[PDB]
Amino acid sequence: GIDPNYRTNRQVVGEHSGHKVYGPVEPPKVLGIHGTIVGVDFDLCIADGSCINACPVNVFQWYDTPGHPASEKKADPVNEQACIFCMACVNVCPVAAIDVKPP
Amino acid sequence: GIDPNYRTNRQVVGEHSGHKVYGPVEPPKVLGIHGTIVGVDFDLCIADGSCINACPVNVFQWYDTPGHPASEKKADPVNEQACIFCMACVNVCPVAAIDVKPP
Ligand code: F3S
Ligand code: F3S
Ligand code: F3S
Ligand code: F3S
Ligand SMILES: [Zn+2]
Ligand SMILES: [Zn+2]
């Protein structure tokens, strides 16, 4: 599962669709974590889709990541700021790849 | 159109589904304004639906108001806190019944 201390343990290295990306990032095998309010560890995500299936406010969208060993698609927190802190995604993810921290 | 100063001009008289309701409220003809972040004047709303049709984060839901002269259904800001301040609803409403104020 995702490191609950990722925001302090990792370096921010870039930005994607309005959110920060925490490294290391060495495409295509290592993609890091996307998001600050709603963080998704792309290296753990296996594209199960329960998060997208549970979120009532459309926080996630599928984002293609060809060449990644865990999956070739990931749930990207494009609308992380719409999060109403349901904590559903955090609990439905079979690999515990999501961490939500209210700002 | 809605009074942009409604939050100070009107009295809060109740709560509905997690949001405040600003009076006067004398059902069924006078229902007031629902919401603080995303305020919808139920007395102006005619159930056009453009707001629901435009909102990407599901802020609104239909709420029945039988007996109201403007319409018998209203767009209720059930998820006002998911608002990402698109200002779309504010502009699509044909009667300017919506006012959005970031907290
Ligand atoms: S595996 Fe990925 S698709 Fe969602 S349910 Fe977990 S973050
Ligand atoms: S289910 Fe959606 S509302 Fe936030 S707690 Fe997860 S991104
Ligand atoms: S009329 Fe009502 S249904 Fe929406 S578009 Fe205007 S608040
Ligand atoms: S379109 Fe939706 S995101 Fe807010 S500005 Fe209106 S309730
Ligand atoms: Zn991203
Ligand atoms: Zn309401």
From Swiss-Prot, chains A, B:
Pfam families documented for this protein: Fer4_10 (PF13237)
Cofactors (names): [3Fe-4S] cluster; [4Fe-4S] cluster; Zn(2+)
Cofactor, how bound (note): Binds 1 [3Fe-4S] cluster.
SUPFAM superfamilies reported in the protein's UniProt record: 4Fe-4S ferredoxins (SSF54862)
Binding locations of [4Fe-4S] cluster: C55, C83, C86, C89
Keyword Membrane listed: no
Positions with a binding annotation for Zn(2+): H16, H19, H34, D76
PROSITE patterns tied to this protein: 4FE4S_FER_1, 4FE4S_FER_2
Keywords: 3Fe-4S, 4Fe-4S, Electron transport, Iron, Iron-sulfur, Metal-binding, Methylation, Repeat, Transport, Zinc
InterPro entries for the chain: 4Fe4S_Fe-S-bd, 4Fe4S_Fe_S_CS, Fd_Zn-bd, Fe-S_Ferredoxin
UniProt domain 4Fe-4S ferredoxin-type: residue ranges: 37-65, 74-103
GO molecular function, one term: oxidoreductase activity
UniProt-annotated binding residues for [3Fe-4S] cluster: C45, C51, C93
Keyword Secreted carried by entry: no
Source species, domain of life: Archaea
Region described as N-terminal extension: 1-36
UniProt modified residues of type N6-methyllysine: K29
Function in brief: Ferredoxins are iron-sulfur proteins that transfer electrons in a wide variety of metabolic reactions.
PANTHER family: ADENYLYLSULFATE REDUCTASE, BETA SUBUNIT (PTHR43687), L-ASPARTATE SEMIALDEHYDE SULFURTRANSFERASE IRON-SULFUR SUBUNIT (PTHR43687:SF6)
The protein, known as: Zinc-containing ferredoxin-1
Protein source organism: Sulfurisphaera tokodaii (strain DSM 16993 / JCM 10545 / NBRC 100140 / 7)
